[PDB]
Amino acid sequence: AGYDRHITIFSPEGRLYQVEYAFKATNQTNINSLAVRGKDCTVVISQKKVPDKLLDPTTVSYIFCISRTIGMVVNGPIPDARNAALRAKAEAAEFRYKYGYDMPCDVLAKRMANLSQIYTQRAYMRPLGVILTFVSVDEELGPSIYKTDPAGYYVGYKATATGPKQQEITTNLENHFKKSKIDHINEESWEKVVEFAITHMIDALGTEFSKNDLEVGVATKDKFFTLSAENIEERLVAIAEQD
Amino acid sequence: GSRRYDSRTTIFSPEGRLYQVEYALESISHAGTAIGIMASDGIVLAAERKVTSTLLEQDTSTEKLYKLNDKIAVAVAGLTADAEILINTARIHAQNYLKTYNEDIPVEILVRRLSDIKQGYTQHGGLRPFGVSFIYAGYDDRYGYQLYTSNPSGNYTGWKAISVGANTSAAQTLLQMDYKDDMKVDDAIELALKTLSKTTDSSALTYDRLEFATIRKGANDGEVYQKIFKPQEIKDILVKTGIT
Amino acid sequence: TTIVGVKFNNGVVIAADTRSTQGPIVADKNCAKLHRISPKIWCAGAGTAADTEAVTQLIGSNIELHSLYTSREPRVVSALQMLKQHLFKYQGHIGAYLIVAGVDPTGSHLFSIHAHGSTDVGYYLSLGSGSLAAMAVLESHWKQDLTKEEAIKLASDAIQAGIWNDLGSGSNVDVCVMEIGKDAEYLRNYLTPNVREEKQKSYKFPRGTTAVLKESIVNICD
Amino acid sequence: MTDRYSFSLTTFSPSGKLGQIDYALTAVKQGVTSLGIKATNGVVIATEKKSSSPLAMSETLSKVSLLTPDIGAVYSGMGPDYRVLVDKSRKVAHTSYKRIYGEYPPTKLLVSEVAKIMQEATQSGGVRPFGVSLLIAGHDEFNGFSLYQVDPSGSYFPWKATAIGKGSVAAKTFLEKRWNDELELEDAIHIALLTLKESVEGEFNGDTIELAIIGDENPDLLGYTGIPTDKGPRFRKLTSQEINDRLEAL
Amino acid sequence: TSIMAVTFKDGVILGADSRTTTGAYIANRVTDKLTRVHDKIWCCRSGSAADTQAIADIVQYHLELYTSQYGTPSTETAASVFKELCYENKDNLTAGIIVAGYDDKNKGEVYTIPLGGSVHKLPYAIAGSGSTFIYGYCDKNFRENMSKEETVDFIKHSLSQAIKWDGSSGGVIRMVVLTAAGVERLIFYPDEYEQL
Amino acid sequence: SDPSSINGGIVVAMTGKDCVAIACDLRLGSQSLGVSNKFEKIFHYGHVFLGITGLATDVTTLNEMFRYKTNLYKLKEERAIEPETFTQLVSSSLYERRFGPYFVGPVVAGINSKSGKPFIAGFDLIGCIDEAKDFIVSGTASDQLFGMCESLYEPNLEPEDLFETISQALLNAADRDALSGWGAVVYIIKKDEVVKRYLKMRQD
Amino acid sequence: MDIILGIRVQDSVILASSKAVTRGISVLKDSDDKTRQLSPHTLMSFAGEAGDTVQFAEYIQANIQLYSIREDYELSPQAVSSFVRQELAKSIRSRRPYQVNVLIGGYDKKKNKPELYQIDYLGTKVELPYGAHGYSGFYTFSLLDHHYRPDMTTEEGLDLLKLCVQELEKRMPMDFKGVIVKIVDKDGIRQVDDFQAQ
Amino acid sequence: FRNNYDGDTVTFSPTGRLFQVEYALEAIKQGSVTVGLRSNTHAVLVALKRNADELSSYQKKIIKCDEHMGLSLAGLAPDARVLSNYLRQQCNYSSLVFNRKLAVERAGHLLCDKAQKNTQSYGGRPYGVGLLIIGYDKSGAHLLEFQPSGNVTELYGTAIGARSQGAKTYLERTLDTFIKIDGNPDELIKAGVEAISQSLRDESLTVDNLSIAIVGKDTPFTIYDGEAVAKYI
Amino acid sequence: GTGYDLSNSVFSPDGRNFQVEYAVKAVENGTTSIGIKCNDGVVFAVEKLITSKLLVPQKNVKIQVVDRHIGCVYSGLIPDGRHLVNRGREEAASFKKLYKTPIPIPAFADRLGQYVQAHTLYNSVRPFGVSTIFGGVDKNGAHLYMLEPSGSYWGYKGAATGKGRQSAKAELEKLVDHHPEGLSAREAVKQAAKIIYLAHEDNKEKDFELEISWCSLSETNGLHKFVKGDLLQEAIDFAQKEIN
């Protein structure tokens, strides 16, 4: 009886505690991230926190290059995050091989969501305590942001945020869009979109950032890449000469 | 390990009873009642639809009477979905027999096979038994008209008249009270309706809450005919027998 | 069989004859050699008929399921990749030779696939026993930037070269145009240059001509 | 490793109840309302697009899905479960039917296939029942239009009209009042829109409502011409605009 | 078929004819035998078109997944994958592949995987039916560290001869230049190379 | 050696005005030895008719198979299968044995119960469908049947006329084939009724 | 091959089967009974490949007896024959097929009529007034085509066989060492121990 | 506490222990004592064979794995049969495939790894036996102590079993002495019998009660029982 | 309720996996071991508690090599550590076989990582009872890594685990601050010996044996080798000296 809380079967209330607790794990790293769409690019921002002085900061990342065109940022423990990353990379490579074209961001998202849905129904597999935000500039849909959770749920966003203070970032972003009346950052360059992203990350979190406190990934037509401490610095300087 | 979450659906109670079978039967007892009556010139199958609404499409509906063969049909009491699984394998077994011996499957052989499948979920595999009890109504050139009944345990038996589902005790006494070996299909049709009429947990016994079927050997032919009554047909036979 | 594919300024067209044959005997005087993989991806096949037809439907089926799963239009390269890997797997035992064409979100495409699994790309292609008669025509009239009409003509002319000069080909010409922005239009029997002349006599027999031994009614109803 | 869960996770309790199926049904009860009305020349299925954030793009999330060109589905309950069920339903329509007979399956049989898939998740080892209830609407040459409901137990039933989810009891009652065997498709679409309004708390328009129909053949949605026998899919999802137009006549 | 890869000062060049035949018939006269398995790692295919295409497609897949996990692969690694497939499946394949890639640390490299599935790293390599006729010529005119223009000339002449004598070769001469600068496609028509 | 030439036999089908006809010979031999002159090659499931030439054991096996499949189809579909549908069932069933085929030459004939339209079709041993409107031929004397049909046939023949035409095609083709004949039966099919007649023919 | 003949008369089915078992250059046995009783009213004769022959017969025998005990009933001759055909039809497409030809003669107690089924190793079944397997058919089919009548008594049937057996002993190259005749009728199966000179 | 975390080997206790393994180790302690020690030329195994009744035999405790290797057991006899048989194969494989005698150090690694598997997967049980392995390979005399935990250690000498602690302290004392008994087997054996007796209490090592095995430089692993050990009692 | 800590893959209400956390306890209860990343290689060293004078000195080696360029050291359940290396060795062999080039350190890290994370996904397995420090020199530099029973791992300048992980980390941090230019292979070997001697105080009761190994582009040609003889004694002394 009391085991309806250890494995993925229903509780008398029709709930799945394990999936709920898996959601809890997604905040364990106390990191916040957000993604916004440009005119022809997609940007993802994520807090980078390196506590130990013995760590090689270059190896501490939660952003992944899934394929030449798809980037993915994870919110949750790194081991589950890397499991999700490897699978996604594999899934994307196979897709291109079997179907002859690059796996679209939303499709990989659905696929990863379906795999997650399964840990939600089969008892021997545990859910992954992570939330996956996928981004790219799809050849058919243009700038794209699709996020999946431990419930096997997924949807596309105009922009989105994830983490402990997800709500503050979300309402901040919501407000900006209620104002702009469009579903994207009307900017030609991605550099300005990256700036916009960092700017609002600051307002919403009420925190200042140094080049080593952030992690940035950008997606453009035919390519997704991550920025370097210096590329960020250049971004941080730029925003500084406006405030 | 997993052992922690295993219900062990196939073990004996200290009294030498099979827990799941006993609990599945308990489940069956709340299912719409199904009645089977065997006459000299045919068999009657009548069942009470559990739960209905004004909006339920009764014309396209079937939840209790299923055709297995052209000479065999069953009345269901329990989980409809569980029943369909068993019904389908039963339909295949009938066809393998036909393809093999070029003769329609004798009623008991089909019933025994289905019962053996159930018996299986009782002795191995760790799966729950099927929450289903069947009343089989068939005809073959070796025993003629036959009536059988099988339940979760995998046990089956033959009857002149029998019921499964809710209020079987009441229904059996009523049947054991007015049944006569020399009955006639039309008599059985009436006995059946009366019995259901007295055991129903509902207000009245209307046609929208029933399924009816008869397996007769239409004298003007020489072959066996199965007839699954249509809404209108049940509504008629309902007025005639005096239930209006 | 004679099947061809011709790309034009805004699409692609495929054509084929309509003769089906068992050895030297014509089994079907008007079969359809043009198959549909998806609404806008059409295929023409030569070789073991059952194989071209089965492989076309199998991949077509999976292409539909894939389209529903990805919420996107099927892409010719996908039909190409799925077809070839399948044929390759079977080392040539599935005698399917096809010319697959179509339009999708990425443009118009023209490919050919062989039983062993190799694929080709080009602006004009032909396969089958009529392959050479047709290619001769295509090699003599094809030019870059053909109009939809010029393409239909060129393709139609190629299939004719086959019908007339190849014994493994004949009867009618089926065409199918796939233009980048519109629906694909299938032209069953676009040409019918082989109508049988009226027979010299009628062979209708006087009733009672045939000697019957026994007669009876057959039961259809159950 | 290896799934060592080869025993059932759904079993009979002393009372005769199958807990997991009951609990699954409870999950369905918490779900957003969805319904279906059968007309004389079409069927309509509809539901509310309960967007989980104004930042989410509700279009990229269809609660109403096409299974075959003449069959659609909608649900109430756990969305993720529904999704994989649609994937499986679309595939079984091919593997178990189109690939054998060369024609799409009639509504009752496909429903039967789906139901089978769900029944198995009620008895197979190591799994939990699907936490959803579906409403499938379709049309086939020999059975005409039909509407079915498939529950977590794997049981299904045909309806003239019905509702599932949150305010199903209320909606069912409202339908019983307005339904008759002479409703035209447009009439049903209207009745549908009315029933759904009682179940929607906030905004009620063509962007918050998802509605589809099984009606006449749409040759314009076929993708090709040249084959007389191929007339187009009967399943069509209404556009945000098409909905609003009918809302002004609400 | 006549194909070759030549390393030179700035990187490497791959060339090939465009004729694929089934008997004496030219099934395709504009074939592109220069296949890309990675940005700056290409190959020349000879033997069974069905086999070499399948091989290449698998390799491309492997290098794509490899890149996802470990970054850009060395040309030596690409040649290792081809080898693994060719050697391990030697009984069912008829493939002769020339692998040529451009790395920044290793500049240009050429590997040849003949029928058996063995691997050979070389300054340049020739293969295909038509290659037999240019062994003498190529041995006599190849020089290490030639200039792009010199290399394009060497390949253009060598192949023009191969095409001249081997009926299984012909059509146009395609080339692919692989250097730090990027990737460049080159083509040469009969009217030009036939009169060299 | 050739599975399709061991037993012998032929089948032919034709369309007429609101009618269809399917006919076959009765021979079953083992090479030169005639064995049975009662081996009919036409069967029917509901109102759909199927004739099968080729290896006798496969003829029998396929019949038992399609009865099996059409029976389940009726139980699930709750209606009898139609000619068009059955033709597809036959095709997929044959192709399913692509690399170990049944050595048969099937022929389907019937009237679509809903559209009243006449329907016939033929298949090669691996399922390739041949859908002709006029006539389908099969068997060891197929060349002859093709010749007879192509000459004797004409559209919209009436039932009583289509009978003469089909019987004359079967009979004369059979008489130029050492492995066919030894009796024959013809089926005249209309929406409502079906007549079966045994023809009188050479017994050599 | 061996001689396997069968003839269905008015009220019975008679099965004649050669007694020789020859391997190469030597006739190893001259009293071989090439028959197995499947059920009290069903008899099966067989000829073919050395080992497959009996192994198959006994296998079918075992299955029919199992059916009989499970159902406490005797399958009709038609049913038993259909079962045997399917067994052979499965066999023909297996790794090593049973190369066996058989004649199944049985009396159908329900129809009260004798039945003769001929089935070859490919699973080819046909019901006949008279049948034969192998080279025998070449000289016995026209004989019977001439001297056979549906209303013949069991006695006329035995005379008919004797006529077949004589033709076989005159024109056949092999010495099949006579035949063993068995009668299947409403009263079961009995053997005619006196055919060596009847 | 413990009761909730000792149901199977796949469960860690809150303090990081694996009770099922520990209970396995407990079967060893309950097992009869056995001793191992080596010089630079030989390695010896001295084991006290235990008997049920006075009508029963004294269960063998030494098993030869190859001409150059062997071990002594303390705990579940069957498990030692299983493990020694495995070691016999590993030795056998080394010779047949590489024509190389298996290094005693490698034998240990193989034993550790085999034991470890039965401590990380559901359904299995740890081996309930301790093993002392001696052998002479290309690097001289060797002595290994094998515990079901998977831990294998190379020592100069040691003992396992009941009261094994006696012999162990004795050897830790005699160390400098016996380690130099090169070229003289009888002396190493005596030094072993003296170490083992340091764990007696119940009785005294008799003839059909003592069991000794030796291996070294020019001595193929051989077992001595009964009369053969009389000259050491 | 409770019991969330009895099955391995179960999420506790606060999103944790207690069995993995308990695995950590087994690690903290083990010997201390470290890794120091130098300017062109990495150094590994570990504490080897001397249970008795019976342990043949220098024999029971702990540091393990993978392929020819990787070194691995761990604290906790030793048998588990060997298991993990056996896997890494296969993982490496597989990689070399297909790609020819010996496996890059990062690539190797994830191989170990994914495998370890895998053992936190099912209740039919136990998590690894070891934290492992490993690294080497590859196509582009030296890399030091530490992997937890959770499967988590990161790149490190210096790393320590086991009983004296705090003393060690304290010491390592000093080094990191006082040497922004990078320590040298020769220097790191000594520094390593000291850190173990220091971190041995948390176990000052039992005597121990030192073990060092390294992989330096200049000192070992990029191959993993064990520090022996003179170089070892020289480092042992450098420690024995700064311990007073």
CSV table of C-alpha atoms in Angstrom, one decimal, chain B residues 25-132:
chain,number,residue,atom,x,y,z
B,25,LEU,CA,-15.4,-13.6,-8.3
B,26,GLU,CA,-16.3,-10.9,-5.8
B,27,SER,CA,-15.8,-8.5,-8.6
B,28,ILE,CA,-18.0,-10.6,-11.0
B,29,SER,CA,-20.8,-10.6,-8.4
B,30,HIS,CA,-21.4,-6.8,-9.0
B,31,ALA,CA,-21.6,-7.3,-12.8
B,32,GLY,CA,-24.9,-7.1,-14.7
B,33,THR,CA,-26.7,-10.5,-14.4
B,34,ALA,CA,-26.5,-12.9,-17.3
B,35,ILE,CA,-28.8,-15.8,-17.7
B,36,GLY,CA,-28.7,-18.9,-19.9
B,37,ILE,CA,-31.6,-21.4,-20.4
B,38,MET,CA,-31.4,-24.5,-22.5
B,39,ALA,CA,-34.7,-25.9,-24.1
B,40,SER,CA,-35.5,-28.9,-26.2
B,41,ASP,CA,-35.5,-26.8,-29.4
B,42,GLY,CA,-32.8,-24.1,-28.6
B,43,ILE,CA,-30.9,-22.0,-26.1
B,44,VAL,CA,-31.6,-18.6,-24.6
B,45,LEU,CA,-29.1,-15.9,-23.5
B,46,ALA,CA,-30.3,-12.8,-21.7
B,47,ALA,CA,-28.2,-10.2,-19.9
B,48,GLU,CA,-28.8,-7.0,-18.0
B,49,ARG,CA,-26.7,-4.0,-19.1
B,50,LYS,CA,-24.9,-2.5,-16.1
B,51,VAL,CA,-25.1,1.3,-16.2
B,52,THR,CA,-26.7,3.2,-19.0
B,53,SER,CA,-27.7,6.7,-20.0
B,54,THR,CA,-30.2,8.4,-22.3
B,55,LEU,CA,-27.2,9.2,-24.5
B,56,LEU,CA,-25.8,5.7,-24.7
B,57,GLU,CA,-26.0,4.4,-28.2
B,58,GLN,CA,-27.8,1.1,-27.6
B,59,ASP,CA,-28.0,0.2,-31.3
B,60,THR,CA,-24.2,0.1,-31.9
B,61,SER,CA,-23.7,-1.4,-28.4
B,62,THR,CA,-22.7,-4.8,-27.1
B,63,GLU,CA,-21.1,-5.4,-23.7
B,64,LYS,CA,-22.5,-8.8,-22.8
B,65,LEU,CA,-23.4,-11.1,-25.7
B,66,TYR,CA,-20.6,-12.0,-28.2
B,67,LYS,CA,-20.5,-14.3,-31.1
B,68,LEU,CA,-17.6,-16.8,-31.0
B,69,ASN,CA,-18.5,-19.2,-33.8
B,70,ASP,CA,-21.6,-19.5,-36.0
B,71,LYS,CA,-22.8,-22.1,-33.6
B,72,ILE,CA,-21.4,-20.8,-30.3
B,73,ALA,CA,-22.0,-17.6,-28.4
B,74,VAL,CA,-21.2,-16.3,-24.9
B,75,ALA,CA,-22.8,-14.1,-22.3
B,76,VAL,CA,-20.3,-12.0,-20.3
B,77,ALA,CA,-20.2,-11.1,-16.6
B,78,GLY,CA,-17.2,-9.0,-15.5
B,79,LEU,CA,-14.5,-6.8,-17.0
B,80,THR,CA,-15.7,-6.3,-20.6
B,81,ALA,CA,-12.1,-5.6,-21.8
B,82,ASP,CA,-10.8,-8.8,-20.1
B,83,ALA,CA,-13.6,-10.6,-21.8
B,84,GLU,CA,-12.7,-9.3,-25.2
B,85,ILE,CA,-9.2,-10.6,-24.9
B,86,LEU,CA,-10.4,-14.1,-24.1
B,87,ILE,CA,-13.2,-13.9,-26.7
B,88,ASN,CA,-10.7,-13.1,-29.4
B,89,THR,CA,-8.4,-16.0,-28.6
B,90,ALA,CA,-11.5,-18.2,-28.4
B,91,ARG,CA,-12.5,-17.1,-31.9
B,92,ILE,CA,-9.0,-18.0,-33.2
B,93,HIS,CA,-9.1,-21.4,-31.5
B,94,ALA,CA,-12.4,-22.2,-33.2
B,95,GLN,CA,-10.9,-21.4,-36.6
B,96,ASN,CA,-7.7,-23.4,-36.1
B,97,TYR,CA,-9.9,-26.4,-35.3
B,98,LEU,CA,-11.9,-25.8,-38.5
B,99,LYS,CA,-8.8,-25.3,-40.7
B,100,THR,CA,-7.3,-28.5,-39.2
B,101,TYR,CA,-10.3,-30.9,-39.2
B,102,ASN,CA,-12.6,-29.2,-41.7
B,103,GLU,CA,-15.3,-29.5,-39.1
B,104,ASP,CA,-16.7,-26.9,-36.7
B,105,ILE,CA,-15.3,-27.1,-33.2
B,106,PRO,CA,-17.3,-29.2,-30.7
B,107,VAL,CA,-18.7,-26.9,-28.0
B,108,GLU,CA,-16.9,-28.5,-25.0
B,109,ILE,CA,-13.5,-28.4,-26.7
B,110,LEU,CA,-13.7,-24.7,-27.2
B,111,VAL,CA,-15.0,-24.2,-23.7
B,112,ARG,CA,-12.2,-26.3,-22.1
B,113,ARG,CA,-9.5,-24.5,-24.1
B,114,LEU,CA,-10.7,-21.1,-22.9
B,115,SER,CA,-10.9,-22.4,-19.4
B,116,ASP,CA,-7.4,-23.8,-19.5
B,117,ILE,CA,-6.1,-20.4,-20.5
B,118,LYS,CA,-7.7,-18.9,-17.3
B,119,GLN,CA,-6.4,-21.8,-15.2
B,120,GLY,CA,-3.0,-20.7,-16.3
B,121,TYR,CA,-3.1,-17.2,-14.9
B,122,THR,CA,-3.9,-19.1,-11.7
B,123,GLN,CA,-0.8,-21.3,-11.4
B,124,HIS,CA,2.0,-19.3,-12.9
B,125,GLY,CA,3.2,-16.0,-14.3
B,126,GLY,CA,2.4,-13.6,-11.4
B,127,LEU,CA,-0.3,-11.8,-13.4
B,128,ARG,CA,-3.8,-11.1,-12.1
B,129,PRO,CA,-6.6,-13.5,-13.3
B,130,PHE,CA,-9.2,-12.4,-15.8
B,131,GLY,CA,-12.2,-10.8,-14.0
B,132,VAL,CA,-14.6,-12.7,-16.2
